[PDB]
Amino acid sequence: LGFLGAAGSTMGAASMTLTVQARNLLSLKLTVWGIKQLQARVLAVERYLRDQQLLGIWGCSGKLICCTNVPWNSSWSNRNLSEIWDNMTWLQWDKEISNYTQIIYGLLEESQNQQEKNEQDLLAL
Amino acid sequence: LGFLGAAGSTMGAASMTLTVQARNLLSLKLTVWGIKQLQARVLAVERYLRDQQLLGIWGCSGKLICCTNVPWNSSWSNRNLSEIWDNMTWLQWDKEISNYTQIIYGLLEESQNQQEKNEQDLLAL
Amino acid sequence: LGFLGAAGSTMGAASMTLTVQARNLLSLKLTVWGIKQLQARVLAVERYLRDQQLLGIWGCSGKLICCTNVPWNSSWSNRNLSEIWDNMTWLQWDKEISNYTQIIYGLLEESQNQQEKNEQDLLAL
Amino acid sequence: IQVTQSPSSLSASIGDTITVACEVSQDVGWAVNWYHQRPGRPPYNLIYTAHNLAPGVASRFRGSRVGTYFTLTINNLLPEDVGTYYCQVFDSFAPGGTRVDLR
Amino acid sequence: VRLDQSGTAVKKPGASVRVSCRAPDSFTVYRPRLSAYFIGEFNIHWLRQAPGQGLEWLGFVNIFRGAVKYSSRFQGRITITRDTSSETSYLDLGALKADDTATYYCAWDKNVDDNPWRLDSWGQGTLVIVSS
Amino acid sequence: NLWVTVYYGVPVWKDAETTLFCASDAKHNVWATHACVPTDPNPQEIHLENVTEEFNMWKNNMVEQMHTDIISLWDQSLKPCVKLTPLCVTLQCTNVNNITDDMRGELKNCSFNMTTELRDKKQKVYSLFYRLDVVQINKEYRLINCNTSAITQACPKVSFEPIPIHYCAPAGFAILKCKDKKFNGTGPCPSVSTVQCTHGIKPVVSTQLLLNGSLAEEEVMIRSENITNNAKNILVQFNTPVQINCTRPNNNTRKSIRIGPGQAFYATGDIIGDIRQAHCNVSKATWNETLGKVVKQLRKHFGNNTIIRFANSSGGDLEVTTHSFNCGGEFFYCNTSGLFNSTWISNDSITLPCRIKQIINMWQRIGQAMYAPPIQGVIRCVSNITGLILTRDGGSTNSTTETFRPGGGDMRDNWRSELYKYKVVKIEPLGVAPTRCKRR
Amino acid sequence: LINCNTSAITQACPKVSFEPIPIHYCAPAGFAILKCKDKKFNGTGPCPSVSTV
Amino acid sequence: DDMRGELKNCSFNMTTELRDKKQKVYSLFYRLDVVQINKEYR
């Protein structure tokens, strides 16, 4: 397949073709077309940089799938793992947890910071 | 706390709230306001990238705090650890070591490259 | 030395002083000069970011030298290792690989992704 | 504010060094200016801000502060320098001025 | 900046005198931001030198809006103005006295923030003589 | 034994230059606020404990940058407006007619010739011009700017009102706000708090007094550079506003005539009703109280024994010697002599005559001159007098009385009051520090 | 001339063509265009056959 | 002898400050900058 090929597929199928669609995240005078193109280019760069920084803060920079250390509170979604990994599509799963998204980001950031501080303390000795 | 919250605090508090003040490093015609805004956005992106590349050279990308392999020459500062981390603010330390920054940056760069080369040579086995 | 110092030198000397040119990869009205400089800066950032994309997809973010886990297919270049690393400068090497880059690039990313997946499946236990 | 400038007059040889001073009654930072006037000629600027050199004049001229005591030093006197000297601060001007002449 | 003054003037007591100080091609300053010529913020001072006496500061005019400031001793009898079209500055002294005779200089001040009251360019000087 | 560690996102900042962008809260305005990024309803505001930072209102670059900005917007709003060159024609003017003794000869009924929509014909058109806009060569007059600079008419749909704009630095930069209520011009500010970006700043255009703007918190403050310097100005900031009502009690109908294909020019039609004189009112008791507070806070830098006298300006152009400002798309120059008459020593209102101008050349530009279009109906505006631009007068050492007069002209001094409590700084999120760890 | 009493008539340059050359609209990086491949798609609503471009 | 007709003293009727009256004004032009139609040149 190619870009966005398996969007409607299952978590199981989509979770193995991250690279094929992650690769395509980045791809004159002062006329209207020129200024529009320049603005679009810089906006795409800014969006990608925001996402990359968000990856980096949780200690997952340069990793397509990284594991974390924050527990999954069942209040977000109590559904069984197999159910959500064998039937749904990614769009439905994202729609389900849309409102529970800032909280998990904050928990992840605090967990990574605490883990990093602990790692430094251990590496002191 | 918040952005720059621990600015007046000592080392102990500031060295644990890095993420909160690192989260906000990144956040249409040819009108004066428009061009000013575009230049500002590009400048912010360029500054962030410069800092991130400097981090990547020292082999600490994706880490808030990382340890290195060169020792602290007393020529830079003779102050002991305890009062350094419990007595003075970050700004004071920066003003104290500002004029020594280039050579220590070079030391980190060279040491990281040497460590990478040695690790590659060892892995060659 | 300086920027591009070992450009004509052999493999060994260049492979020891990468960081001298890695660090030099990143360094108002709407007149001709203004738009020209803005386009130049945006283009430089975009090129460095595409380079960072290609490095990150290979799981070597922040590393000047990283190793992979794919065989060197002799169909690309079946030449003796010692003569490659003691005779041909990087330029001639590129002129003898330039036809074969895309495929190997893809191989890299695929392997990396697969490796990551496998690693995750290992860590779930 | 009042400015007192000393000495009223002085005499010197060729090539020697001299000093002319003035005290201002307040604290004025380094906002002192030095002016020289040849006889029958319009005065021209030499020292501005009490430690900078005006363009188009010799480097033998110098000026400095010590507390509120501003002074101008001349080295290697060349007898075209015969004339008058004044220090200005802000709006006030030093009364009289100091006249320098050869022996 | 080259500064051209007026000529020698002789006036009887009780009259009025006027001295013209021309500073050609120096009132306007480029503003590279907008890329246009704006009237500068420079100052024109007026000094006098009595025969055998130190200089005395009369007053100065910021030529941007023509603002003025006179020495309180001469207040009420001296007017200072500028004409931007011909790039000149006019001093108007009223009801001169016998001691008013002197050499009157016009001086240019760059009005830079760092250096205060720096008068760089000086006019050739004018001879204003009053007698009966 | 020690080692070095790098820290990202370290709270270090250094004062630095930086371009800032406007941001307002949601009509074409002369300040292009429609291009400003909308601001968040709740701006973030973070206090900083144990933080002491130096400030310098006079070395601040924010005022210079924002002055350059305001100039740029002012010119840009004029570029797509009607050219007014064909107005420079001989004007047959007569005196105007139910007029009080004050406005005798200050309004001219001028008839002249104009090029119509076509070109083979010309039309006789009459209009009303203020005396300050015409000069003699019925009598033949001509516009005041005909032998110097060109005239461009401001399009009569741009609101000249100052809509507040917040200046905001991009990411990686911060703004520091001095919360110290007793903060003079420069020096350390113990109560300093960071902010995302500036508060509501009104680009009010005025010369002698400060209109609207922002007030103090504790009491009236006197901020300046060296108060010893007669040349340097004196900014004043009040603790309570002085309510000033300025109005033009003429009906002042507007007549739209055609001077070119598509381009149209708006002239002053015949005034309906009595022709009075535009004037301003300030509460006498409130003004006396404000002046007393000002002199009490001002005696600190001069001594109780010293005498303080307020006098009207010593001379200059119409836009400095008088109180010049803009109200409702019109320009006023108020005599203001009655506002400075005290001789402070150890219900009634103060009417101020005002004059109206239409050929405006603010920020003197060699070649340009705005023509302010007439405004229909009587015009009135209530404003807050908040600060004064005073200037000292050099005196003899023996003399013990200091005379203060209104000044201005240099709009940087006007604009520094609204940005005196802000500093633009660059965040340096990279630090190095010695720890005992050693990387594997 | 008709518009001379209200407008400011300007002549189009002679050599500039008015013929509509086909153009393509492209979204920047990080964005996609979803095209409804379905041939029975009325005004609004779901389109079961979506293709990216 | 090298300026025989090279410099032309040309006068015209450029408008004065106000755009209603004409004023006779003279100037000098280089022969390469004028074309004939004293005589008339443009």
Ligand SMILES: *[C@@H]1O[C@H](CO)[C@@H](O[C@@H]2O[C@H](CO)[C@@H](O[C@@H]3O[C@H](CO)[C@@H](O)[C@H](O[C@H]4O[C@H](CO)[C@@H](O)[C@H](O)[C@@H]4O)[C@@H]3O)[C@H](O)[C@H]2NC(C)=O)[C@H](O)[C@H]1NC(C)=O
């Ligand atoms: C200090 O701030 C105060 C508060 O804003 C400010 O007072 C305002 O002054 C303006 C200036 O005229 C007033 O605006 C007018 O309001 C009346 C009543 O609503 C309107 O009828 C007027 O309409 C005219 O202007 C329109 C502009 O597009 C035209 O379209 C229209 O046809 C009319 O010609 C005009 O908007 C305003 O009412 C007051 N009050 C408030 C609350 O805004 C004061 O001016 C400021 N001080 C200054 C600027 O020195």
Ligand SMILES: *[C@@H]1O[C@H](CO)[C@@H](O[C@@H]2O[C@H](CO)[C@@H](O[C@@H]3O[C@H](CO)[C@@H](O)[C@H](O)[C@@H]3O)[C@H](O)[C@H]2NC(C)=O)[C@H](O)[C@H]1NC(C)=O
């Ligand atoms: C553009 O035209 C105006 C009006 O004609 C010019 O202003 C006028 O300039 C003359 C120059 O001689 C002034 O005359 C002077 O008047 C004073 C009294 O104020 C008198 O003492 C002098 O001897 C002299 O006669 C006149 O006052 C002045 N009027 C105004 C209203 O400004 C202006 O200079 C012209 N600009 C040009 C030609 O660039």
Ligand SMILES: *[C@@H]1O[C@H](CO)[C@@H](O[C@@H]2O[C@H](CO)[C@@H](O[C@@H]3O[C@H](CO)[C@@H](O)[C@H](O)[C@@H]3O)[C@H](O)[C@H]2NC(C)=O)[C@H](O)[C@H]1NC(C)=O
């Ligand atoms: C300035 O002067 C002009 C010139 O008169 C005034 O404009 C209007 O001019 C017309 C023709 O010249 C006047 O029309 C005549 O009015 C008289 C009296 O009303 C009438 O008897 C005639 O039959 C003819 O209609 C017209 O009156 C005049 N406008 C007014 C209001 O009278 C212009 O009004 C003058 N500006 C002023 C007075 O502010």
Ligand SMILES: *[C@@H]1O[C@H](CO)[C@@H](O[C@@H]2O[C@H](CO)[C@@H](O[C@@H]3O[C@H](CO)[C@@H](O)[C@H](O)[C@@H]3O)[C@H](O)[C@H]2NC(C)=O)[C@H](O)[C@H]1NC(C)=O
């Ligand atoms: C510019 O010129 C055009 C062409 O004349 C003007 O449009 C015309 O305007 C007049 C008056 O506004 C209209 O006259 C009216 O016509 C109706 C019939 O439709 C009649 O019943 C009325 O009694 C009145 O006479 C005329 O219709 C109109 N023509 C068109 C084609 O719209 C226009 O107003 C002018 N613009 C200006 C002067 O700014």
Ligand SMILES: *[C@@H]1O[C@H](CO)[C@@H](O[C@@H]2O[C@H](CO)[C@@H](O)[C@H](O)[C@H]2NC(C)=O)[C@H](O)[C@H]1NC(C)=O
């Ligand atoms: C250019 O080529 C020459 C020779 O091909 C290189 O000289 C070598 O220098 C190293 C460093 O001392 C010696 O160990 C080798 O023995 C030299 N080569 C020979 C054949 O003796 C030189 O380093 C190359 N690069 C530059 C920048 O000159």
Ligand SMILES: *[C@@H]1O[C@H](CO)[C@@H](O[C@@H]2O[C@H](CO)[C@@H](O)[C@H](O)[C@H]2NC(C)=O)[C@H](O)[C@H]1NC(C)=O
């Ligand atoms: C008077 O004005 C001068 C203008 O320079 C001030 O002098 C500067 O003061 C700053 C302190 O903020 C110093 O860093 C500069 O080096 C000074 N420069 C000069 C040329 O003096 C001065 O502080 C002001 N006040 C007084 C009392 O003089």
Ligand SMILES: *[C@@H]1O[C@H](CO)[C@@H](O[C@@H]2O[C@H](CO)[C@@H](O)[C@H](O)[C@H]2NC(C)=O)[C@H](O)[C@H]1NC(C)=O
């Ligand atoms: C504004 O307040 C600051 C804080 O006190 C003043 O700074 C000091 O003021 C005292 C008294 O005037 C001086 O003795 C010190 O030398 C000042 N500090 C420095 C570093 O020079 C400052 O002077 C005040 N500004 C004005 C105009 O009064």
Ligand SMILES: *[C@@H]1O[C@H](CO)[C@@H](O[C@@H]2O[C@H](CO)[C@@H](O)[C@H](O)[C@H]2NC(C)=O)[C@H](O)[C@H]1NC(C)=O
């Ligand atoms: C100013 O002039 C306007 C225009 O004539 C006046 O408004 C008119 O007032 C009359 C009665 O006074 C009404 O019959 C009209 O309908 C109004 N409008 C027009 C377009 O004529 C206004 O009254 C005058 N005085 C003011 C504004 O104080």
Ligand SMILES: *[C@@H]1O[C@H](CO)[C@@H](O[C@@H]2O[C@H](CO)[C@@H](O)[C@H](O)[C@H]2NC(C)=O)[C@H](O)[C@H]1NC(C)=O
């Ligand atoms: C400013 O104050 C003056 C005097 O207090 C006001 O003038 C009076 O206004 C009223 C109502 O308009 C008239 O009836 C009077 O005839 C006016 N004159 C006098 C002497 O009372 C004026 O209206 C005030 N203007 C503003 C805008 O407040």
Ligand SMILES: *[C@@H]1O[C@H](CO)[C@@H](O[C@@H]2O[C@H](CO)[C@@H](O)[C@H](O)[C@H]2NC(C)=O)[C@H](O)[C@H]1NC(C)=O
């Ligand atoms: C300026 O205008 C304001 C508002 O119209 C006037 O304030 C009014 O004053 C009267 C008498 O003092 C009171 O009865 C009203 O309640 C006030 N209204 C408001 C909204 O404040 C004020 O008097 C006018 N003149 C001055 C000098 O401020």
Ligand SMILES: *[C@@H]1O[C@H](CO)[C@@H](O[C@@H]2O[C@H](CO)[C@@H](O)[C@H](O)[C@H]2NC(C)=O)[C@H](O)[C@H]1NC(C)=O
């Ligand atoms: C400031 O106030 C003084 C008060 O005397 C004004 O001086 C008088 O102004 C009139 C105006 O025509 C002259 O006729 C008098 O001759 C002036 N008197 C003197 C002694 O010169 C002065 O004009 C005012 N300044 C302003 C309003 O800018």
Ligand SMILES: *[C@@H]1O[C@H](CO)[C@@H](O[C@@H]2O[C@H](CO)[C@@H](O)[C@H](O)[C@H]2NC(C)=O)[C@H](O)[C@H]1NC(C)=O
């Ligand atoms: C500004 O206002 C003052 C005072 O209202 C005016 O001074 C008056 O001038 C006239 C004519 O010269 C004298 O008869 C009065 O005696 C003056 N009054 C005072 C208090 O001195 C002055 O002329 C006005 N200036 C302008 C430019 O309007």
Ligand SMILES: *[C@@H]1O[C@H](CO)[C@@H](O[C@@H]2O[C@H](CO)[C@@H](O)[C@H](O)[C@H]2NC(C)=O)[C@H](O)[C@H]1NC(C)=O
């Ligand atoms: C003039 O000053 C008054 C002072 O009270 C201003 O009124 C205050 O405005 C602030 C901000 O808009 C509010 O937070 C206060 O609640 C207001 N207080 C009162 C008593 O009204 C007024 O906004 C200023 N500007 C004007 C009148 O245009």
Ligand SMILES: *[C@@H]1O[C@H](CO)[C@@H](O)[C@H](O)[C@H]1NC(C)=O
């Ligand atoms: C779509 O649904 C079918 C139904 O089983 C499934 O086989 C397929 O993998 C799904 N995804 C794609 C991309 O076809």
Ligand SMILES: *[C@@H]1O[C@H](CO)[C@@H](O)[C@H](O)[C@H]1NC(C)=O
């Ligand atoms: C300010 O300093 C005091 C010193 O006693 C300290 O206790 C306090 O925590 C500091 N403030 C902050 C915000 O850390």
Ligand SMILES: *[C@@H]1O[C@H](CO)[C@@H](O)[C@H](O)[C@H]1NC(C)=O
């Ligand atoms: C203010 O009021 C006091 C009360 O007597 C008076 O002495 C003083 O002159 C007044 N100041 C003015 C009107 O400026």
